[PDB]
Design an enzyme around this catalytic site. Structure first.
Site, PDB file in Angstrom:
ATOM      1  N   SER A 183       0.828  -1.208   0.052  1.00 36.98           N
ATOM      2  CA  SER A 183      -0.040   0.108   0.111  1.00 36.98           C
ATOM      3  C   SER A 183       0.989   1.279   0.107  1.00 36.98           C
ATOM      4  O   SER A 183       1.462   1.670  -1.166  1.00 36.98           O
ATOM      5  CB  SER A 183      -0.903  -0.059   1.174  1.00 36.98           C
ATOM      6  OG  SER A 183      -2.007   0.607   0.736  1.00 36.98           O
TER       7      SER A 183
ATOM      8  N   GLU B 221      -9.397  -5.241  -3.671  1.00 36.17           N
ATOM      9  CA  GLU B 221      -8.598  -4.021  -3.409  1.00 36.17           C
ATOM     10  C   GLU B 221      -9.325  -2.921  -2.693  1.00 36.17           C
ATOM     11  O   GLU B 221      -9.052  -2.114  -1.706  1.00 36.17           O
ATOM     12  CB  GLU B 221      -7.928  -3.120  -4.439  1.00 36.17           C
ATOM     13  CG  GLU B 221      -6.461  -3.977  -5.043  1.00 36.17           C
ATOM     14  CD  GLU B 221      -5.521  -4.304  -3.928  1.00 36.17           C
ATOM     15  OE1 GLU B 221      -5.411  -3.515  -2.938  1.00 36.17           O
ATOM     16  OE2 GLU B 221      -4.567  -5.159  -4.220  1.00 36.17           O
TER      17      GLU B 221
ATOM     18  N   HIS C  57      -7.567  -5.548   0.877  1.00 34.94           N
ATOM     19  CA  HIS C  57      -6.522  -4.815   0.917  1.00 34.94           C
ATOM     20  C   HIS C  57      -5.741  -5.023   2.226  1.00 34.94           C
ATOM     21  O   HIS C  57      -6.360  -4.928   3.239  1.00 34.94           O
ATOM     22  CB  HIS C  57      -6.736  -3.304   0.991  1.00 34.94           C
ATOM     23  CG  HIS C  57      -5.510  -2.344   0.711  1.00 34.94           C
ATOM     24  ND1 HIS C  57      -4.833  -2.439  -0.612  1.00 34.94           N
ATOM     25  CD2 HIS C  57      -4.962  -1.533   1.221  1.00 34.94           C
ATOM     26  CE1 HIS C  57      -3.894  -1.416  -0.481  1.00 34.94           C
ATOM     27  NE2 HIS C  57      -3.950  -0.923   0.514  1.00 34.94           N
TER      28      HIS C  57
END
Ligand SMILES: C[N+](C)(C)CCCCCCCCCC[n+]1c(-c2ccccc2)c2cc(N)ccc2c2ccc(N)cc21
Ligand SMILES: C[N+](C)(C)CCCCCCCCCC[n+]1c(-c2ccccc2)c2cc(N)ccc2c2ccc(N)cc21
Ligand SMILES: *[C@@H]1O[C@H](CO[C@@H]2O[C@@H](C)[C@@H](O)[C@@H](O)[C@@H]2O)[C@@H](O)[C@H](O)[C@H]1NC(C)=O
Ligand SMILES: *[C@@H]1O[C@H](CO)[C@@H](O)[C@H](O)[C@H]1NC(C)=O
Ligand SMILES: *[C@@H]1O[C@H](CO)[C@@H](O)[C@H](O)[C@H]1NC(C)=O
Ligand SMILES: [Cl-]
Ligand SMILES: [Cl-]
Lengths: 534, 536
Positions: free
Chosen positions: B203, B328, B441
């Site tokens: 990320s 995601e 995510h």
């Protein structure tokens, strides 16, 4: 003489000819006049009904083809010649044809009225693919087909004027429809069950009769094959018609409307056809110079507005497209395409093609089309790019406009059936890459494969019999399904909810959902929003 | 010394350290935790670039994790493991620049490839001491030397008054860079090979890795890189100098502050918690997947926008591994899109969808938003709640991660780099987020680090075998720049990603499967059309 070939209609006596169909005889009354020849001072004017005649009018042969441009792109090529005039050209061309079973039906038979296509600039009811003997003999149908003015003679307009009001070619069709109401019974046809069907411009014409009140009392059901009244090519604004008309006037030496039109009337027919193509606003394909005009008369508003706000409660409609609506048109103007090679194109040729294929598109709009049709896994592949150019043209001009029409008609009360024709005639002479081209389902609906001498496969002949059944069942009842036969599969009505349509090919009917749903949403919902701002 | 474990005493440029012997499933590992690599960036040092740590005397105790950088703490779901697992697990403090090292026990005889982890957390949170970043498994099982560092987040690490001297911006990235230099100079003391350093992160951590790839001064500190669910390009990882200035001065006003020197000086007098309390009030519009203080295109650390840099960069001698998880965007929906909750199915209406799109693509015009809606709508069932819910997730995931990653993979591949791509599709059996969120995510991390190898964590046996496979891929890539195992022709190979074939693999319980085109059609919409819409 033969009482079966002798009929009396409101204008007088006619003598038809007994014709031979694979399984028996049929009665044919060809070249029946339904209007005063629209010649001389009647050029560009609305048709007038045919004055009564004396004696027995000979109706055993096809009359002249309405004056029109003749295709010369591929001299001697069957693929193109089959659409060219097959009788003398003349402005004296307002005649219709009737086929009926032999002997004439004992009880009123549903009537099918064919309206040919040809981009509103060509066509004729005498072409071999529109031969109505098969439907008449095999299904016992009364089939009618009329000639109507095309090109400048049928659509040149100076909106608002009295001498060139526009849409007279559509009025020719309407007069033929009135003629059917008044005289079809004499042939054994049921005026209370008239189904209109046509292809391409003929389909758009059918659509226009659906949208023009005065026509609505002349028919009951409709079939639109690969064409619609809405869409980018079937109509032009009063403004654009005037522009093209005055520009054509100029190109031939003419010159106030009255004066301009008077001078246009003194010009030989071929002079007008000679310059017909020079009035188009941009380089393009699937665009035609003289077409119906939103006159605020025949068409009270744009077909778009009319189909969005119309009430189609008591109407049954059958609509559909062929597998490759656009292939055909690519060879008439897109660099890189020919009927003689594979037409594998470059990406550059593709972007160029799109500007020609979507002539009215801005640069941003063109870019959106390119990005939508590009296959991002093989962005440079020649075969995909070629097939994609075909799809762009077919979707923009036919498929999406048809999806749009199906949806509005279904949402607004109509009973709708939709299809996609996917069988390529074994005898097709266009190259393979063109697939099932625009117009090639017609020979099957009319039943030509039933003629042994035409060399179609046994399967094709069974296929044609199926189709003839669908169409005539639809004409008889407003439902293409066979009333008695208890295991089909059934052809379901098209609805906004399920969006069901069937595939017409050698295999049994197959039901599918969503007619190019994602792609047509692009054309019907996004692109519009794009240009009204940008 | 005298009685201590002689295997836990080590010396680095700043002094002597004492580590701790930790237990891993299959054996012991050495851990050196809380090593200082910078002078505490406190007081007048707030907002300023880090300064190297001055040498200390005696043996510094490196047996426990140090403070977590001051940051916002999530409270959306009190007591919920799904969110708590990312919350600080040590005291919060501005005195937080420390790093950690894990190495085999006893320390490796010959130089071992080094893996450096950079955590995510939208640049506003995170810490190298979280349980999911535990380096003991990679060290014990693969004999790897793993390093992780804390770097300043939020205002402390990214508030910037571009052009000023007291708040130049990107200091959090500089903290990372300083930790990378520390590795170059001292990792050999632990048996690590400074000439084989692979950076990996997820990320914001992945975005960070990408920025080190794009900033020259960092290029000599590492050799390979892994970007998991994140990229330096994209809509959230950076802001323009103008936007950063705007946010910083707005935040200054919010806390009673007012010339840059005066402003920054006043900000420095403010309690850390006051800055955190107003951090979120400076975002331009209502939104999700947008963070207040992130890397700024300062024309220094970032000479130009990441977009310009990846379009014109030469990535000849670079090996990169990139990828995304199956869902995601799911995670982000519950933080601001009306209708979404972790406690129900989140079936939404079409109206909620159009509204979610405005929040999910906050910078989109009305025309652009309509384009998104028309593209993601399933026209066969345009009103189906389940599809709309899943489409909202896809919009957020594609716009923020998937397409930016596809963009990155493409440019890197076209410009000389060796690229490997994947899509992680396995949902942890232990996940506590609802099923509709799929593989959210951040949830591939526990597998790459090998947590399933710990019996007490209750992962299935297949998951444990899966974890071992992934650890092999990552360490193989770190060792050779190729995830594939040379001694094994059976296992299907993982092919490099190229502009031509666009190949990537699926990571799940099944053996590797090669696929082509990473959301090719949809990413063409995001990466090629939407921008052009913007140029008008
Ligand atoms: C601004 N200004 C108007 C002055 C120039 C702009 C160019 C726009 C015109 C392009 C028309 C599309 C090509 C059609 N097109 C043309 C034509 C018209 C104008 C320019 C070039 C070619 C053609 C011409 C003749 N004389 C005879 C037969 C054909 C023809 C026949 C069938 C068919 N389907 C398309 C055809
Ligand atoms: C022009 N003008 C300034 C007048 C109006 C524009 C403000 C719109 C900003 C919306 C930010 C998106 C929601 C974030 N958001 C907010 C927030 C910020 C501003 C307005 C409404 C809510 C929040 C608020 C506080 N006090 C503390 C923690 C959080 C929070 C915590 C975590 C997280 N991920 C997101 C959060
Ligand atoms: C799902 O939840 C959304 C958010 O509401 C919160 O969660 C629900 C379960 C309640 O506990 C409520 O008090 C919370 O504020 C709702 O907006 C949404 O309507 C819910 N979905 C449906 C239709 O059940
Ligand atoms: C096909 O023929 C056309 C014109 O004859 C030409 O422009 C095009 O390059 C040809 N394409 C191929 C397949 O060579
Ligand atoms: C793992 O399972 C055991 C046995 O049910 C249980 O006592 C323990 O609390 C569980 N721990 C986790 C990681 O959930
Ligand atoms: Cl958040
Ligand atoms: Cl919140």
């Amino acid at each position: 003489e033969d009482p079966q070939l002798l009929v009396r209609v409101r204008g007088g006596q006619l003598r038809g000819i007994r014709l031979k169909a694979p399984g028996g005889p049929v009665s044919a009354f060809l070249g029946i006049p339904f209007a005063e020849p629209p010649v001389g001072s009647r050029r560009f004017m609305p048709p007038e009904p045919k004055r009564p005649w004396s004696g027995v009018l000979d109706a055993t042969t096809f009359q002249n083809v309405c004056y029109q441009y003749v295709d010369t792109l591929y001299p001697g090529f069957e693929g193109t010649e089959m659409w060219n005039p097959n009788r003398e050209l003349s402005e004296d061309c307002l005649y219709l044809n009737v086929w009926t079973p032999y002997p004439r039906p004992a009880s009123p038979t549903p009537v099918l009225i064919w309206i040919y296509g040809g981009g509103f600039y060509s066509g004729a009811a005498s072409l071999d693919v529109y031969d109505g003997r098969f439907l008449a003999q095999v299904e016992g149908a009364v089939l009618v087909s009329m000639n109507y003015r095309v090109g400048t003679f049928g659509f040149l307009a100076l909106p608002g004027s009295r001498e060139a009001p526009g849409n007279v070619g559509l009025l020719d069709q309407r007069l033929a429809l009135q003629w059917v109401q008044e005289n079809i019974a004499a042939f054994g046809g049921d005026p209370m069950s008239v189904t209109l069907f046509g292809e391409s411009a003929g389909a758009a014409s059918v659509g226009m009769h659906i949208l023009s009140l005065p026509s609505r009392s002349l028919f009951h059901r409709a079939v639109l094959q690969s064409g619609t009244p809405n869409g980018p090519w079937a109509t032009v604004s009063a403004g654009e018609a005037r522009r093209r008309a005055t520009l054509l006037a100029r190109l031939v030496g003419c010159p106030n409307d009255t004066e301009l039109i008077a001078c246009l009337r003194t010009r030989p027919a071929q002079d007008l056809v000679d310059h017909e193509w020079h009035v188009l606003p941009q380089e393009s394909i699937f665009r035609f110079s003289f077409v119906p005009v939103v006159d605020g008369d025949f068409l009270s508003d744009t077909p778009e507005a009319l189909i969005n706000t119309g009430d189609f409660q008591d109407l049954q409609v059958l609509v559909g497209v062929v597998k490759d609506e656009g292939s055909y048109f690519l060879v008439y103007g897109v660099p890189g395409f020919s009927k003689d090679n594979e037409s594998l194109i470059s990406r550059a040729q593709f972007l160029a093609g799109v500007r020609i294929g979507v002539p009215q598109a801005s640069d941003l709009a063109a870019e959106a089309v390119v990005l939508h049709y590009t296959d991002w896994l093989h962005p440079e592949d020649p075969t995909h790019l070629r097939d994609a150019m075909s799809a762009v043209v077919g979707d923009h001009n036919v498929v999406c406009p048809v999806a749009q029409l199906a949806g509005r008609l279904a949402a607004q009360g109509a009973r709708v059936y939709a299809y996609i024709f996917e069988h390529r005639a074994s005898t097709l002479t266009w190259p393979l890459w063109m697939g099932v081209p625009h117009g090639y389902e017609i020979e099957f609906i009319f039943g030509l494969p039933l003629d042994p001498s035409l060399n179609y496969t046994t399967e094709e002949r069974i296929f044609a019999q199926r189709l003839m059944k669908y169409w005539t069942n639809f004409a008889r009842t407003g439902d293409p399904n066979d009333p008695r036969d208890s295991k089909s599969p059934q052809w379901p009505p098209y609805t906004t909810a399920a969006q069901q349509y069937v595939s017409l090919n050698l295999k049994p009917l197959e039901v599918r959902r969503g007619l190019r749903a994602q792609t047509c949403a692009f054309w019907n919902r996004f692109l519009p929003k794009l240009l009204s701002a940008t």
